Amino acid sequence: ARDPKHDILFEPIQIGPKTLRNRFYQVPHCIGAGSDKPGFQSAHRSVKAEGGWAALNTEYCSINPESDDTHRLSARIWDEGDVRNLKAMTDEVHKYGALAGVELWYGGAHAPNMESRATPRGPSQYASEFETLSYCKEMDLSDIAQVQQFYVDAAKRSRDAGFDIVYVYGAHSYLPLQFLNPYYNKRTDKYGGSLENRARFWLETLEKVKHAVGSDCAIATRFGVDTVYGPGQIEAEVDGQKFVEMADSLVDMWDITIGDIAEWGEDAGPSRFYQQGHTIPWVKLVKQVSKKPVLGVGRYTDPEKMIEIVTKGYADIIGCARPSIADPFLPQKVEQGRYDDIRVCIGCNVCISRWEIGGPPMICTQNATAGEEYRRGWHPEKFRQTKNKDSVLIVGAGPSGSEAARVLMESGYTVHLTDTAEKIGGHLNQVAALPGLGEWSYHRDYRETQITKLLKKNKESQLALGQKPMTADDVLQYGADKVIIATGARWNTDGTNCLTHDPIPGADASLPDQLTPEQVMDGKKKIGKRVVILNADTYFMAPSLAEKLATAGHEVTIVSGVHLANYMHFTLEYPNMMRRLHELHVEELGDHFCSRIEPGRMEIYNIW
Amino acid sequence: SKILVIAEHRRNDLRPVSLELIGAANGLKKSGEDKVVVAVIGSQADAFVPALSVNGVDELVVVKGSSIDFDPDVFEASVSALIAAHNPSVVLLPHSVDSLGYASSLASKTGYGFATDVYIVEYQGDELVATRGGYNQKVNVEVDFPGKSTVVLTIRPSVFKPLEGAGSPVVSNVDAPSVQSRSQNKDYV
Amino acid sequence: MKILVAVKQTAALEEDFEIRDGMDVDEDFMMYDLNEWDDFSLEEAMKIKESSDDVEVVVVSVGPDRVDESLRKCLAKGADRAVRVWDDAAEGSDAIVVGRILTEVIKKEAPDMVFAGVQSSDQAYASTGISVASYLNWPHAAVVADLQYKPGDNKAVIRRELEGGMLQEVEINCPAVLTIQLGINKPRYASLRGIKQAATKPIEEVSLADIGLSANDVGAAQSMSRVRRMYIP
Numbered sequence A: 001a002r003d004p005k006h007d008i009l010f011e012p013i014q015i016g017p018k019t020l021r022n023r024f025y026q027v028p029h030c031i032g033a034g035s036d037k038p039g040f041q042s043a044h045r046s047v048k049a050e051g052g053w054a055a056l057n058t059e060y061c062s063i064n065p066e067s068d069d070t071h072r073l074s075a076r077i078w079d080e081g082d083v084r085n086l087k088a089m090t091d092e093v094h095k096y097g098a099l100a101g102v103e104l105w106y107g108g109a110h111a112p113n114m115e116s117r118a119t120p121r122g123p124s125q126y127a128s129e130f131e132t133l134s135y136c137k138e139m140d141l142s143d144i145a146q147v148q149q150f151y152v153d154a155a156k157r158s159r160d161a162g163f164d165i166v167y168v169y170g171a172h173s174y175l176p177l178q179f180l181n182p183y184y185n186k187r188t189d190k191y192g193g194s195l196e197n198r199a200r201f202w203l204e205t206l207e208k209v210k211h212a213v214g215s216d217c218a219i220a221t222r223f224g225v226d227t228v229y230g231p232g233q234i235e236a237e238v239d240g241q242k243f244v245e246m247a248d249s250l251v252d253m254w255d256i257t258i259g260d261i262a263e264w265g266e267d268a269g270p271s272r273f274y275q276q277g278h279t280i281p282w283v284k285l286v287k288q289v290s291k292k293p294v295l296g297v298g299r300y301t302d303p304e305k306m307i308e309i310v311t312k313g314y315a316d317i318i319g320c321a322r323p324s325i326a327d328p329f330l331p332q333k334v335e336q337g338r339y340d341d342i343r344v345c346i347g348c349n350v351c352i353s354r355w356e357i358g359g360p361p362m363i364c365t366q367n368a369t370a371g372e373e374y375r376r377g378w379h380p381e382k383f384r385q386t387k388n389k390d391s392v393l394i395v396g397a398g399p400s401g402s403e404a405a406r407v408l409m410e411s412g413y414t415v416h417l418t419d420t421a422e423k424i425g426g427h428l429n430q431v432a433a434l435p436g437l438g439e440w441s442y443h444r445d446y447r448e449t450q451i452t453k454l455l456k457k458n459k460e461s462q463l464a465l466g467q468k469p470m471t472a473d474d475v476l477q478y479g480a481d482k483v484i485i486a487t488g489a490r491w492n493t494d495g496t497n498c499l500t501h502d503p504i505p506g507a508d509a510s511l512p513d514q515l516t517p518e519q520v521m522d523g524k525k526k527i528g529k530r531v532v533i534l535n536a537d538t539y540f541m542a543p544s545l546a547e548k549l550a551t552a553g554h555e556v557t558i559v560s561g562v563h564l565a566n567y568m569h570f571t572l573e574y575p576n577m578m579r580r581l582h583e584l585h586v587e588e589l590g591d592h593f594c595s596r597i598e599p600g601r602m603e604i605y606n607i608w
Numbered sequence B: 001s002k003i004l005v006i007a008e009h010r011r012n013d014l015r016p017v018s019l020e021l022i023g024a025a026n027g028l029k030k031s032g033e034d035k036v037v038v039a040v041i042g043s044q045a046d047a048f049v050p051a052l053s054v055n056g057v058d059e060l061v062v063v064k065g066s067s068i069d070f071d072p073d074v075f076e077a078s079v080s081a082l083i084a085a086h087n088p089s090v091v092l093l094p095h096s097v098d099s100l101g102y103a104s105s106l107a108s109k110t111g112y113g114f115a116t117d118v119y120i121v122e123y124q125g126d127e128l129v130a131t132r133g134g135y136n137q138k139v140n141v142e143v144d145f146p147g148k149s150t151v152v153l154t155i156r157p158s159v160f161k162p163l164e165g166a167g168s169p170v171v172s173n174v175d176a177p178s179v180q181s182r183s184q185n186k187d188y189v
Numbered sequence C: 001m002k003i004l005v006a007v008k009q010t011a012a013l014e015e016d017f018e019i020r021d022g023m024d025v026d027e028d029f030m031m032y033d034l035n036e037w038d039d040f041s042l043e044e045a046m047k048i049k050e051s052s053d054d055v056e057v058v059v060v061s062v063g064p065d066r067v068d069e070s071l072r073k074c075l076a077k078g079a080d081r082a083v084r085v086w087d088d089a090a091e092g093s094d095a096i097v098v099g100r101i102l103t104e105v106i107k108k109e110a111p112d113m114v115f116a117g118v119q120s121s122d123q124a125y126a127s128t129g130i131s132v133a134s135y136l137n138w139p140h141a142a143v144v145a146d147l148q149y150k151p152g153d154n155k156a157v158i159r160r161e162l163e164g165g166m167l168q169e170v171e172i173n174c175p176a177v178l179t180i181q182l183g184i185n186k187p188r189y190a191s192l193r194g195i196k197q198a199a200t201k202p203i204e205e206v207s208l209a210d211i212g213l214s215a216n217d218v219g220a221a222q223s224m225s226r227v228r229r230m231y232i233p
């Protein structure tokens, strides 16, 4: 049963005119649905409402076409069409007793407007440091009044759409933050200069929105209380706290983040760099001055960490984005004391990577039903039950084979899962041993735990590890009705690569001076002093091996025929990864690949 | 009447659990007048008299046998002989690998009270009550031993605290039954 | 040549089980399966069988009808024959009473070697095997982590796993009773076809009268301790 100390997480809390039923709150987050895939939006949020979350928010929700994020996908509330589409989500969230919230967004020059082609407006004219070809027009006084009116009209549409909670969004350096922050705001009139003047845009917006919908909706605000950039942007104990004091009477609930837009992996901290609770030192500064309920995200998945921040008085509410994606049912599982059923977010940011690429639906490393609830009918916690006594053999217990076993066992099937490996997890066991990636092990820990419990209740199923490798004869004679082959992949040993699709002459990882990732991670093969990594992969392997090797004292050079760590731009890991490689003295040679290798030397070429 | 502790040693050294058992025995007496006898068994067990001449020990019987260290046939024969000669109310063995080798054999023959891996012992008036685990340690199980004049317990190590300081026990030596054991200890690895 | 492996079907409890009377946990919260140490016992017998020519491996268990499920698993995992001993009067038989029961079926079977697990996962008496040795009057060793034995020899060499990981070699007369420790080998897993074939096999049922015992020899009434109370600490 639930630990009595977690009872606090299930106490209601008032926010203006509305009541949260418990302290579990899904802050606004992208999913790749917006107002364009109303099925996906309504299923994704409503499964979490069924799962016990007290409030579910849309992602950033454009108030007008001159804040259009195309090629990235935002929600929109521009007209009656959008009101109909989003109301599917509010109706569905209400069916499970949760509040529904919308996040009113205007991006200034950060929105590249590739669909609308309209001109964004801003406190001063700048080219966005994130969208570097996108510029805004400087706002005159009427412009300011016009954009304020956009917020008002969107907030009235939001009430029509059935939302309970309406945000003025001033985090990730969007428009209210731009007026606040002298990095953007160069004005010398009464909206620039002193704090009072810099806050005036966001304060008037809040007053107008509260005036229009406040009797009916909680007015929340999301605030990047510190840009984590040092002086020169917003700092929590300089402008941050003082702004909270100025706005406190207008806000029903504070939702606090850190960081800017170009580097918002400081907010959505990758486990590679940040532990659960990494934001606390900045976030707790808000309750030092606010009299209103406060939340601030921090990759919260553990109820022990959750009651800590509430009992100490650092936050009232547990805000979550990623934990709610990994486990829509995290709150119900805490409520029922089913702690070992919690599917814990690994902080890989693959979910975000989809959004960042611009256009595709979200996917999730832990939760293979994220994005699939509506379009495939896949509920994360409900499984169609088999009507036969079919048995399935599964060769390999890596992420795919172990997922297949888990789902088949939850579906009532007899399964026999087998692997040569000592533990569940396949290639993820070495991957999670790379520098910074220890939390990626939760993906296999969850499956190891679940499989062990499913065997206790599915009595004809079996797990066999440390086995002799299955042969074709072993499979054919095994006695299963269906067989799944999940035997994995390996890194190439002969130089085969995406540029030429052929081996490289002289490449051979059986030679004493050449190694694959697996040989490096195994740790047995000796490595010399001067290391060259030859890279044709754009995700984490080459950078992570470079980190591991330079930290162990090697002199490392990366020769990359593809854009090094390109995919880490999308996971938001790229900036701290580059800082890490720089401070470790890893040398990079971009735009080169290799035509032949020999003992102790290789021939490289410029790709252009 | 008497409480019998069977001490334990290996490769020349007394195993500290021996002191914990003296601890337990002393905490269990139903009167200052009850006496704790400790026995140490081995061909060279006279060497342990110094380490066993400690607070709580009223009699130290050294029993010499065939084996230097633990052997199941020797120990069973030796302990049955100690029990018959000292008629103790309670005999305390460590719950140790050595004791697994013979403890339950002592009980099978005899109809003595027997419980293993005991972590609470107590008298409730005149009935001995022992607590051990159940269902993979998820419960405590309290047991008693009706009409049993001799109860044999094995005791979980690192639970009972040893007495402090030295003692002045009457030492005796005896010989094991010279019967040849059906096993032979060879080397340690 | 015959190796007889005594096996036990152990109880595991669901969260959050309840004490029923105060004399036990409520049955509804109990799941039964093959004692973990018995996989290693059984494997060692199968190693011996597979290392030579002709060795009958028989498994034997004292308990009610539900035990059939665990003896079947043994058949699937290599055992040649399975025997179940029972009478309702044996409920509440302690480790020493079960040792007596096992002794009388072992005599009926007349094996060359007896293997027991070091302890059961549920009650962890660490007593039943060695109680069997005492009633059989057979040489015995407890906590065996290595076994050198060839069928028909007089004479086996074991290693005892002591506190702190250290091992002691012991030469032991046969026939002997050995209690087998975790880690001695790598127990095998039967395949679905193995299990299906095990399903066709008989479980031989043996009563107390069959082994010269009666209601008066068994049960809680004949045991060396008496449960006063179970509680969650």
Ligand SMILES: *c1c(C)c(C)cc2c1nc1c(=O)[nH]c(=O)nc-1n2C[C@H](O)[C@H](O)[C@H](O)COP(=O)(O)O
Pocket (backbone or CB within 6 Å): A027, A028, A029, A030, A031, A058, A059, A060, A103, A171, A222, A257, A267, A268, A269, A297, A298, A299, A300, A319, A320, A321, A322, A323, A351, A352, A355, A362
């Ligand atoms: C998109 C994606 C998928 C991620 C996970 C976060 C995110 C996304 N879009 C957001 C947006 O539409 N508006 C906004 O205010 N915040 C958005 N987020 C950031 C998210 O809300 C959280 O601030 C971070 O993910 C950190 O919280 P947590 O994941 O550690 O709980």
Ligand SMILES: Nc1ncnc2c1ncn2[C@@H]1O[C@H](COP(=O)(O)OP(=O)(O)O)[C@@H](O)[C@H]1O
Pocket (backbone or CB within 6 Å): A395, A396, A397, A398, A399, A400, A401, A402, A418, A419, A420, A421, A425, A426, A427, A428, A468, A469, A470, A471, A486, A487, A488, A489
């Ligand atoms: N013939 C085989 N028999 C049993 N297991 C195998 C065999 N070949 C490969 N495997 C196992 O398959 C697993 C594949 O896992 P992994 O590489 O993580 O693949 P995936 O990412 O698709 O789940 C490894 O744990 C490996 O040991």
Ligand SMILES: Nc1ncnc2c1ncn2[C@@H]1O[C@H](COP(=O)(O)O)[C@@H](O)[C@H]1O
Pocket (backbone or CB within 6 Å): C005, C006, C007, C008, C009, C035, C037, C038, C060, C061, C062, C063, C095, C098, C102, C115, C116, C117, C118, C119, C120, C121, C123, C124, C125, C126, C127, C128, C129
């Ligand atoms: N009811 C039983 N039937 C057959 N063997 C048993 C039974 N109970 C215990 N054993 C044996 O004793 C072993 C160790 O358990 P124990 O002394 O009961 O903790 C088991 O692995 C079996 O070999």
Ligand code: SF4
Pocket (backbone or CB within 6 Å): A322, A323, A325, A326, A344, A345, A346, A347, A348, A349, A350, A351, A352, A363, A364, A365, A366, A367
């Ligand atoms: S993709 Fe990774 S960071 Fe995102 S919710 Fe899933 S497990 Fe967490």
